[PDB]
Coordinates of C-alpha atoms in Angstrom, one line a residue:
X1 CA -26.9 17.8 -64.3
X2 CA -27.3 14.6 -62.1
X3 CA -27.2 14.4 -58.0
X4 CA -27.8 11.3 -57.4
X5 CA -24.7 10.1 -56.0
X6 CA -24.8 13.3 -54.1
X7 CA -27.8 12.8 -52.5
X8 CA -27.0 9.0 -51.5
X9 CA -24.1 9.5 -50.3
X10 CA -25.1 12.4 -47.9
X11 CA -28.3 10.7 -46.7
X12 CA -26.0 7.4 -46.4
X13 CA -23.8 9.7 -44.3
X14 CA -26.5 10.6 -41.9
X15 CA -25.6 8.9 -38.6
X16 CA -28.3 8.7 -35.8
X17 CA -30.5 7.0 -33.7
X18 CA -33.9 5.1 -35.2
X19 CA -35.4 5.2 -31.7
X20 CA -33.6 8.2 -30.2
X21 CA -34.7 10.7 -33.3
X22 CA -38.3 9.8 -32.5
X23 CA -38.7 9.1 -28.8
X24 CA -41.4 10.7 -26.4
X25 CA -40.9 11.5 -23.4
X26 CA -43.5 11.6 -20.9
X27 CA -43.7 12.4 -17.4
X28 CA -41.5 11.7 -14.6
X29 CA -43.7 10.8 -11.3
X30 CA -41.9 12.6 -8.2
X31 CA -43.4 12.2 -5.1
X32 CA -47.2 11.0 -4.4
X33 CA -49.3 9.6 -1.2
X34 CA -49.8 5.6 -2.1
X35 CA -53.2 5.7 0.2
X36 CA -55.1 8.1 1.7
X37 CA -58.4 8.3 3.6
X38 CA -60.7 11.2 4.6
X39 CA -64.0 11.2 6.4
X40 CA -66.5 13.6 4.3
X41 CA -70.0 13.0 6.3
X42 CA -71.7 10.2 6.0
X43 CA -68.5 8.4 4.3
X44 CA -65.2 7.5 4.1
X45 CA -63.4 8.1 1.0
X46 CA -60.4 5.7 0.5
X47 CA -57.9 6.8 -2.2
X48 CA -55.1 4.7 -3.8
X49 CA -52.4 5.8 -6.0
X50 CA -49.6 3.4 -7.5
X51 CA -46.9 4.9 -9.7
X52 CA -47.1 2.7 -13.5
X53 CA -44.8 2.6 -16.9
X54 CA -46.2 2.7 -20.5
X55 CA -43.8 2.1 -22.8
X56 CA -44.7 1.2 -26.6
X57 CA -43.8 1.5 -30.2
X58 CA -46.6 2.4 -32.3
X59 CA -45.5 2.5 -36.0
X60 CA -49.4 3.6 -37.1
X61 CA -49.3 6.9 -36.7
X62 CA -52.4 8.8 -36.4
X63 CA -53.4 11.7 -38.9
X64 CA -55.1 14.7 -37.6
X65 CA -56.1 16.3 -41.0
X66 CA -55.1 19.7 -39.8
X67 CA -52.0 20.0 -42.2
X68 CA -52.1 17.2 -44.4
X69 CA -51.4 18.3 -47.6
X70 CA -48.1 16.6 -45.7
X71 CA -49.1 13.1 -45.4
X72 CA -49.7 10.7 -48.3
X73 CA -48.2 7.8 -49.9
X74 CA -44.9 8.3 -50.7
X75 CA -44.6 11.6 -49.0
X76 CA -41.3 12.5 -47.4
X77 CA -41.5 14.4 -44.1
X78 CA -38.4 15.1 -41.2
X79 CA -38.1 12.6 -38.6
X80 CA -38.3 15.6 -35.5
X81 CA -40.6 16.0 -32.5
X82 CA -43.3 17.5 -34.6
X83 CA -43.4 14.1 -36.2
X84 CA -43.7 12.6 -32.8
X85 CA -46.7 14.9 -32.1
X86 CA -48.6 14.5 -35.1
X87 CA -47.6 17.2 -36.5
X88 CA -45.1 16.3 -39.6
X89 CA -43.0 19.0 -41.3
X90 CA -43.3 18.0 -45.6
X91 CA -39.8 17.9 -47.5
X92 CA -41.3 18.9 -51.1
X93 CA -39.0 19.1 -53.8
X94 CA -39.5 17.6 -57.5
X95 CA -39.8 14.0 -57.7
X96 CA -39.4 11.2 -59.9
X97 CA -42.4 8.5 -60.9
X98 CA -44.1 6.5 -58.4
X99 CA -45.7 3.5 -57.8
X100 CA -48.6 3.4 -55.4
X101 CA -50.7 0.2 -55.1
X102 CA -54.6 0.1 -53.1
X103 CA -56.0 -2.8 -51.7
X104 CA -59.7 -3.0 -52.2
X105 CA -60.5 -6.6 -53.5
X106 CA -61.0 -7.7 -56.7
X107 CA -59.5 -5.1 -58.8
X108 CA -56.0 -6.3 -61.3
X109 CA -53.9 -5.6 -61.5
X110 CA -55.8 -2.3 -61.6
X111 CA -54.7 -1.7 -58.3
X112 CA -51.3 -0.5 -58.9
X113 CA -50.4 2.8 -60.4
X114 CA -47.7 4.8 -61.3
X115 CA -47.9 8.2 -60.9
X116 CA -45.8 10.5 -63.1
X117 CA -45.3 13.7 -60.3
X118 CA -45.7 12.4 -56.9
X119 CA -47.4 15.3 -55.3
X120 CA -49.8 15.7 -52.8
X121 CA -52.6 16.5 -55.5
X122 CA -51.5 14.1 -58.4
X123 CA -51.7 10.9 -55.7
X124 CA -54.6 12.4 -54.0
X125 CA -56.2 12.3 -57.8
X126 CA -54.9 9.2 -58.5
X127 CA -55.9 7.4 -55.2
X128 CA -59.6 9.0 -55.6
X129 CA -59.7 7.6 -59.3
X130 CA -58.7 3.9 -58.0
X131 CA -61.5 4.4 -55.4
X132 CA -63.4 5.0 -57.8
X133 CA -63.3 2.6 -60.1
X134 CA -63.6 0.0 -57.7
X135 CA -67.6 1.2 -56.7
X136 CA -67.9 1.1 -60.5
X137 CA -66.1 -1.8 -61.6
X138 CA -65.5 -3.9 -58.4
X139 CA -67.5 -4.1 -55.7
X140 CA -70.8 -4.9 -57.2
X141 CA -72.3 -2.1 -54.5
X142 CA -71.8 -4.5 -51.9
X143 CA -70.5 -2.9 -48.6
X144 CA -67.0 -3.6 -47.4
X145 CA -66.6 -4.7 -43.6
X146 CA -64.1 -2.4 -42.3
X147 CA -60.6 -4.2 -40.4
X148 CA -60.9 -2.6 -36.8
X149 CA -57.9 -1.4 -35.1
X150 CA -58.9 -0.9 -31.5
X151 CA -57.5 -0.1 -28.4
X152 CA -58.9 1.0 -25.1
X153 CA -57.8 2.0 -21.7
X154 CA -58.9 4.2 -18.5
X155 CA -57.6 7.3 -18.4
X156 CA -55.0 9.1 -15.8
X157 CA -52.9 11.6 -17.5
X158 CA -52.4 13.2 -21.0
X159 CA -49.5 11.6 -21.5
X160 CA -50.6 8.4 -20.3
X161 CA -53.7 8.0 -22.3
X162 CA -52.2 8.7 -25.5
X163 CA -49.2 6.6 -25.2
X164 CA -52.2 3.5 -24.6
X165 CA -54.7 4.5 -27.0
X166 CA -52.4 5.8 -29.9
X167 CA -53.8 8.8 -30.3
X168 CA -53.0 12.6 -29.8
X169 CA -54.7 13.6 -26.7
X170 CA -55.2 17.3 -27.9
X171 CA -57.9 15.7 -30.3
X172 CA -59.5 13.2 -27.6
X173 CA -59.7 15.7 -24.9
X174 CA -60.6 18.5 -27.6
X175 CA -63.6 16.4 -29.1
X176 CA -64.5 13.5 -25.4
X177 CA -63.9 16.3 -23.1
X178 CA -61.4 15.1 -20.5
X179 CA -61.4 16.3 -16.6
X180 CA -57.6 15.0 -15.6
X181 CA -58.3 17.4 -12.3
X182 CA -61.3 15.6 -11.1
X183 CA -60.1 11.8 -12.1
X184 CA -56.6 12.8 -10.1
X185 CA -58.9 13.8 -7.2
X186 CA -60.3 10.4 -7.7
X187 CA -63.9 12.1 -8.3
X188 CA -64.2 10.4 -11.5
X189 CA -63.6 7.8 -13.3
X190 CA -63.0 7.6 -17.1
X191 CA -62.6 5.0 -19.9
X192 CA -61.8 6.1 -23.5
X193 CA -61.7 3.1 -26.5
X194 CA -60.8 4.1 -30.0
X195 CA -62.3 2.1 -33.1
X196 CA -59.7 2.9 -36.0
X197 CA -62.3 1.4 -38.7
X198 CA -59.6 1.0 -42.1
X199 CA -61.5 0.4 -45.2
X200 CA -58.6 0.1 -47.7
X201 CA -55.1 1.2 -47.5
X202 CA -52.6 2.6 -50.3
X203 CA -48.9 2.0 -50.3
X204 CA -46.2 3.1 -52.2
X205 CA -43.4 1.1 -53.5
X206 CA -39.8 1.4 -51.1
X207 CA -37.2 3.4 -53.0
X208 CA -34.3 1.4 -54.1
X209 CA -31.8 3.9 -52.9
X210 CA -32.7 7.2 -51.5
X211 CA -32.1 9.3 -54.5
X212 CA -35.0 7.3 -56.7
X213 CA -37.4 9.6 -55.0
X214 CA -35.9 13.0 -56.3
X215 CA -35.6 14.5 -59.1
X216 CA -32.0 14.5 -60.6
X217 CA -31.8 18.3 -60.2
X218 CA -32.1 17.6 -56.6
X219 CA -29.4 18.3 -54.6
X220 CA -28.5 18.0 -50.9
X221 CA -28.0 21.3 -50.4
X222 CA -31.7 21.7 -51.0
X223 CA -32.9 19.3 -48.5
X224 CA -30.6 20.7 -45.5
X225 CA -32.6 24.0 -46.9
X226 CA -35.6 22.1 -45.9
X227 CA -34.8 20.7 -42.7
X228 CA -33.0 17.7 -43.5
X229 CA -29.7 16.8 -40.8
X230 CA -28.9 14.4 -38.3
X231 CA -31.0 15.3 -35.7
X232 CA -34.5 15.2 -38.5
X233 CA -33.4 13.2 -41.1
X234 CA -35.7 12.1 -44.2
X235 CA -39.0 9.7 -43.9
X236 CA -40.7 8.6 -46.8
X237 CA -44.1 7.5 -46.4
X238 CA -44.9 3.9 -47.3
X239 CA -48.2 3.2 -46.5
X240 CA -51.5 5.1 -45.6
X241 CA -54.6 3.7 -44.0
X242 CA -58.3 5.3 -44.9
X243 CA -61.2 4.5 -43.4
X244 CA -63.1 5.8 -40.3
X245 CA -62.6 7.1 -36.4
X246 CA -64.8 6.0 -33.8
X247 CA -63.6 7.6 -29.9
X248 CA -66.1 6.0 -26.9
X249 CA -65.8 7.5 -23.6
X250 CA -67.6 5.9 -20.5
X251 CA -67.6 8.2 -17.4
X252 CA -68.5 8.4 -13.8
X253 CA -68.6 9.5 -10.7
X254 CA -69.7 5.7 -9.1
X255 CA -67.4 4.9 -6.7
X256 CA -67.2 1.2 -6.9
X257 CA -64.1 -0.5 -7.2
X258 CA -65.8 -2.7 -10.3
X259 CA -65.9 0.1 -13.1
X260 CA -63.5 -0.9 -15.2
X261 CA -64.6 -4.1 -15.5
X262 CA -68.4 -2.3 -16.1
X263 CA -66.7 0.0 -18.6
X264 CA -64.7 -3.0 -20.5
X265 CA -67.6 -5.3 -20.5
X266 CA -70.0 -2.8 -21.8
X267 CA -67.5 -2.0 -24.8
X268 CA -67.2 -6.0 -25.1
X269 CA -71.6 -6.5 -25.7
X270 CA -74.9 -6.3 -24.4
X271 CA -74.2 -9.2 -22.0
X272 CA -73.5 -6.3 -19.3
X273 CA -77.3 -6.1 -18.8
X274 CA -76.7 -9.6 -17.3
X275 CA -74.9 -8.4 -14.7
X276 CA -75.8 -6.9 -11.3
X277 CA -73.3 -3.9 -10.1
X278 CA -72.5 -3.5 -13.7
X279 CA -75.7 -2.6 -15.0
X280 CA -75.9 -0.2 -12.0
X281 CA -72.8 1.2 -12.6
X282 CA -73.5 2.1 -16.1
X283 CA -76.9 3.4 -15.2
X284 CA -74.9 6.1 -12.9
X285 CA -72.7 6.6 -16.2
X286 CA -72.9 8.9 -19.2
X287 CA -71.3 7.9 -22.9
X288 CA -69.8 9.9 -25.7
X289 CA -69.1 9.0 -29.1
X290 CA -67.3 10.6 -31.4
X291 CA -66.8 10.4 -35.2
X292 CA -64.1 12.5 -37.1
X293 CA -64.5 13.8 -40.4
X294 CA -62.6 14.8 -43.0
X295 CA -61.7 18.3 -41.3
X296 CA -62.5 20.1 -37.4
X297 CA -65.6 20.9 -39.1
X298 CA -67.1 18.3 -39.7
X299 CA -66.5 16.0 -36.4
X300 CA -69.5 14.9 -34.9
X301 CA -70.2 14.4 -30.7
X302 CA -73.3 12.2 -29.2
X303 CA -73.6 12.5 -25.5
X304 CA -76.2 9.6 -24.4
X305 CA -77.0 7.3 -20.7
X306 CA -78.3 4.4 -23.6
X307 CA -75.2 2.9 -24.4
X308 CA -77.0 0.8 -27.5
X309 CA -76.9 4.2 -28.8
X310 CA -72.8 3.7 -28.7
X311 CA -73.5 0.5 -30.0
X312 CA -75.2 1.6 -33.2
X313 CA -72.3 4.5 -33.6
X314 CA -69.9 2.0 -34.0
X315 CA -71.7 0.2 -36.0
X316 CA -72.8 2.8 -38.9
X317 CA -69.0 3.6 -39.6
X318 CA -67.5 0.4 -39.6
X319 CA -68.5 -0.6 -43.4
X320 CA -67.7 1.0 -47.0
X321 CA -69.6 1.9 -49.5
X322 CA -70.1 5.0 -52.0
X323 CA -71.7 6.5 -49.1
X324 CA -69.7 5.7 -46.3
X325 CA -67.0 7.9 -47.7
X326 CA -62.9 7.5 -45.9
X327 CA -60.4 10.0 -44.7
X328 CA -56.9 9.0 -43.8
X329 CA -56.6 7.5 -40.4
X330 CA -52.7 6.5 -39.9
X331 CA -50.2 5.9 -41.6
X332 CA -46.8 4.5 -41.4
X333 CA -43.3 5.6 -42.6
X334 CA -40.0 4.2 -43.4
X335 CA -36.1 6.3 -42.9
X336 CA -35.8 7.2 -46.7
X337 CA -31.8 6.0 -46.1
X338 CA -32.6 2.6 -44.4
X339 CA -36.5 1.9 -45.6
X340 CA -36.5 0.9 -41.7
X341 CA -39.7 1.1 -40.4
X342 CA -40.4 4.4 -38.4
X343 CA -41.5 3.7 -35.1
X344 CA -42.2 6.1 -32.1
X345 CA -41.5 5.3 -28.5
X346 CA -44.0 6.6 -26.5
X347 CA -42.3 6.2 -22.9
X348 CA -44.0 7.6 -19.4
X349 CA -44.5 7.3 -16.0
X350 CA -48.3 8.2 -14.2
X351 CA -50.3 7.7 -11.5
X352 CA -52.9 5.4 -11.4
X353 CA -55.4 6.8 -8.9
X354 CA -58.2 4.3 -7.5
X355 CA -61.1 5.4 -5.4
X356 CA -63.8 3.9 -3.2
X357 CA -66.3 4.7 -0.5
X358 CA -67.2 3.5 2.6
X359 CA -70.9 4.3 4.5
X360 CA -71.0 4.6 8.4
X361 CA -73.6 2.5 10.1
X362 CA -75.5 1.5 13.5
X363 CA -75.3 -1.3 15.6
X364 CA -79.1 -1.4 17.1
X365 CA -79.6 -3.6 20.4
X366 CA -82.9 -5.3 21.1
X367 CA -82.6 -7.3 24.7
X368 CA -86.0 -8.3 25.6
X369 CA -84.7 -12.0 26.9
X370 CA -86.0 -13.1 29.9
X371 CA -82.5 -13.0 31.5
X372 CA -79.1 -11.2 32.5
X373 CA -77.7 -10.6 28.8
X374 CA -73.9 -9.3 28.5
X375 CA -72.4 -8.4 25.3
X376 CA -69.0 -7.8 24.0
X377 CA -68.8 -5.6 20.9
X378 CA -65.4 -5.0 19.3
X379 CA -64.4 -3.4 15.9
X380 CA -61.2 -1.1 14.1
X381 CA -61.1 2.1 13.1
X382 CA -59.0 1.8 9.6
X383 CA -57.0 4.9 8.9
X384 CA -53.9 6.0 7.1
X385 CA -50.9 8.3 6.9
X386 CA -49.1 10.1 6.3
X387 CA -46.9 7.7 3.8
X388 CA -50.2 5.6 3.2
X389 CA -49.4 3.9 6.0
X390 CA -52.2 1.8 7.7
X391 CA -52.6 2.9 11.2
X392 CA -55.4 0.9 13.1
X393 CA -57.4 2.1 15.9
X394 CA -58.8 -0.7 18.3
X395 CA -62.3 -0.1 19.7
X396 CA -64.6 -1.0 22.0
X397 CA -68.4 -0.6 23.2
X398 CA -68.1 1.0 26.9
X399 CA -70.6 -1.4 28.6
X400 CA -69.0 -4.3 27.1
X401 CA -69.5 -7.1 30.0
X402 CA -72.0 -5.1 32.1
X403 CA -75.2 -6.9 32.6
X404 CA -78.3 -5.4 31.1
X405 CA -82.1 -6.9 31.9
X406 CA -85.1 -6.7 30.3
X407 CA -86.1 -4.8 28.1
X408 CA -83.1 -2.9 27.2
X409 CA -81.8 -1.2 24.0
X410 CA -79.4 1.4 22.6
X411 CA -77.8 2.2 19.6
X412 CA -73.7 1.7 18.6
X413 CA -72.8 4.4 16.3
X414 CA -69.4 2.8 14.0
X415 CA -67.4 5.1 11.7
X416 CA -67.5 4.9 8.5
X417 CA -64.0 3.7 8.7
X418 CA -64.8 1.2 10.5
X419 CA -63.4 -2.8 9.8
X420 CA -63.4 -5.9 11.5
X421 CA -66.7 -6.2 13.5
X422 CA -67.4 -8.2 16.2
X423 CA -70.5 -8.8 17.9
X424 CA -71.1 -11.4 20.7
X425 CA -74.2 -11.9 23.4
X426 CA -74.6 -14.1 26.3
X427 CA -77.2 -14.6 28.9
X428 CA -76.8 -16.3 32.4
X429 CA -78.8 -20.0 32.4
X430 CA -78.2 -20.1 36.0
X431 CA -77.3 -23.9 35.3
X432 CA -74.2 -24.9 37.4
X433 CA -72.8 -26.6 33.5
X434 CA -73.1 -23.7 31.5
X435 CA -73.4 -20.9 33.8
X436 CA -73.1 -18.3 30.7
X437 CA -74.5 -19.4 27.0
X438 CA -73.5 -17.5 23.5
X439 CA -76.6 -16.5 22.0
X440 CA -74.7 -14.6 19.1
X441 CA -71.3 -15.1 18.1
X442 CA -70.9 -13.2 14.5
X443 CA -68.0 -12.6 13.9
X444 CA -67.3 -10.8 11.2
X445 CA -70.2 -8.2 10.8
X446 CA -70.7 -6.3 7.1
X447 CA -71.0 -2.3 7.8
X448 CA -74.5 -2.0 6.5
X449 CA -76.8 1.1 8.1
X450 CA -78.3 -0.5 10.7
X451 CA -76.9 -3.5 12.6
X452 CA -80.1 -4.3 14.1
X453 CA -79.1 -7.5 16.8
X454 CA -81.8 -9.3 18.7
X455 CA -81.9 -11.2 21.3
X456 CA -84.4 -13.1 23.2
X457 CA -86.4 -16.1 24.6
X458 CA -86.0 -18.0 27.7
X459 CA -82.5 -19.2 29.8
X460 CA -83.1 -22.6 28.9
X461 CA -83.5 -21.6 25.1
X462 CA -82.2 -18.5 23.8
X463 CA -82.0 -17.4 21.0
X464 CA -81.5 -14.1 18.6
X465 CA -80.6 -12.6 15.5
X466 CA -78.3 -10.1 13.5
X467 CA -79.8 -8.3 10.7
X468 CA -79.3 -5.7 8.3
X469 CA -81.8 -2.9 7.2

């Protein structure tokens, strides 16, 4: 007895949503402070926060080989949240021939096969054969550079970072090691980058109609029994990428406002020793690399402050040979009614927290001019709240405009808050056309730990100096 007009016209019946049946959902950011500051001791710490969108269609989907057994060419699976999570459910019922076809060079021809029972094991066996007989026949033992599917991206929330990097973050924070409490608290910083190193791919020839896929003793009645409906309909599996995973993650607790651009230049080459806050940066940074293997098992995590030693990680698994041996990476589907490629929409909101550090500092005055010296020392106190609202304290040196003789000295202590420095010194020439004379006029001083200004000489000449220890 035959189905197959049966199960066509109930999978031609299905009516849904392509993008609806496998959207994610992320987060939905509330309420958040935009800017914040907060004296610790010797610092100020600013934080910024700016509520951001990710919203993307990935239609690679990563494998996690925990269950999979599900995932192959030309496997069917539901199209249901579990998809969306890496987590496919298999629809497994008997199946008519199939066609799969690899794409290592050089081979017929010999490249396409059809196999007779479309199971996990028969492909699997037929895939490892093809595989095979390329090393023997094909490749001359030459090692095959690997096509690199990479994506990177600093990381704020669960949601956020997997949505950017295309990958489950159960597997990057299970194998990197993510603190989401301490980068929130803006008292890290982290980028991840993930090297999807494909080394050959196999797909499987698109069904004509639905029912080409199943045997005739098939019937719809059996699929619904397998999850099949509206809400998860069918998804047959057209094309699997194998190869090798490489994850990087570059963190720190530097509080410069350049890491990112350290972090993304380091991943970019070994130019980043030529450069100067970069370089120190990364030296107050610590690398992980991870590889996958084939199962939990057999993952493997380096820790290292040499990032060369990243380098070379990268490097060792982005070529095939006999020895350099693949798993399946990703993979991408098509709804078994439509053969419309099966995206997911990855949509979320986050915060994007920034943090940086300010250092208090000293103004140190030397008058040792042989004169009446006044001086006239302004700066702000920058702070903020309660809605990240700048508020701006003016201040002001007390003896601003007394007269001081000398020798004279004392020392200006500014908050490390503190903006907009001004620093000015005059000194009485007792000459009827310039009765008072600038000796500094600067300006627009830089915070540093000790404002060390200096003035001396005669009346007629003046003359001193600000400078920075």
């Amino acid at each position: 007895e035959d189905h197959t007009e049966e199960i066509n016209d109930k999978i031609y019946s299905l009516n849904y949503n392509e993008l609806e049946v496998l959207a994610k959902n992320g987060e939905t950011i509330e309420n958040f402070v935009p800017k914040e500051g907060v004296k610790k001791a010797d610092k100020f710490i600013v934080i910024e926060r700016k509520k951001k969108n990710i919203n993307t269609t990935p239609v690679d989907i990563s494998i996690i080989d925990s269950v999979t057994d599900r995932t192959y060419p030309a496997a069917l699976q539901l199209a249901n949240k579990g998809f969306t999570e890496n987590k496919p459910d298999a629809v497994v019922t008997k199946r008519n021939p199939q066609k799969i076809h690899i794409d290592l060079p050089g081979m017929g021809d010999k490249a396409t096969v059809e196999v007779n029972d479309p199971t996990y094991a028969n492909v699997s066996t037929a895939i490892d054969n093809l595989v095979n007989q390329w090393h023997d026949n094909y490749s001359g033992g030459n090692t095959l550079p690997a096509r690199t599917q990479y994506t990177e991206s600093m990381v704020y929330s669960k949601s956020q970072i997997e949505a950017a990097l295309n990958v489950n973050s159960k597997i990057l924070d299970g194998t990197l090691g993510i603190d989401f409490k301490s980068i929130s608290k803006g008292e890290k910083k982290v980028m991840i980058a993930a090297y999807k190193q494909i080394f050959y791919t196999v797909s499987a020839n698109l069904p004509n109609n639905p029912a080409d896929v199943f045997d005739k003793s098939v019937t719809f009645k059996e699929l619904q029994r397998k999850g099949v409906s509206n809400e998860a309909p069918p998804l047959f599996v057209s094309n699997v990428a194998y190869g090798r995973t490489v994850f990087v993650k570059l963190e720190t607790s530097s509080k410069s406002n350049d890491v990112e651009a350290a972090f993304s230049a380091a991943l970019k080459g070994t130019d980043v020793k030529t450069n100067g806050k970069y370089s120190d940066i990364l030296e107050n940074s610590s690398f992980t690399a991870v590889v996958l293997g084939g199962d939990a098992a057999e993952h493997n995590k380096v820790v290292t402050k040499d990032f060369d030693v990243i380098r070379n990680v990268i490097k060792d698994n982005a070529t095939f040979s006999r020895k350099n041996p693949a798993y399946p990476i990703s993979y991408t589907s098509v709804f078994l009614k439509n053969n419309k490629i099966a995206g997911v929409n990855n949509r979320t909101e986050y915060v994007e927290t920034t943090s940086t550090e300010y250092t208090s500092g000293k103004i140190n005055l030397s008058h040792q001019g042989a004169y009446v010296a006044q001086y006239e020392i302004l700066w702000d106190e920058i702070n903020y709240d309660d809605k990240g609202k700048e508020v701006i304290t003016k201040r002001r040196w007390d003896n601003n405009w007394y007269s001081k003789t000398s020798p004279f000295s004392t020392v200006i202590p500014l908050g490390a808050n503190s903006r907009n420095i001004r620093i000015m010194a005059r000194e009485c020439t007792g000459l009827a056309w310039e009765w008072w004379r600038k000796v500094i006029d600067e300006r627009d001083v830089k915070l540093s730990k000790e404002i060390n200004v200096n003035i001396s000489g005669s009346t007629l000449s003046p003359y001193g100096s600000i400078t920075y220890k």
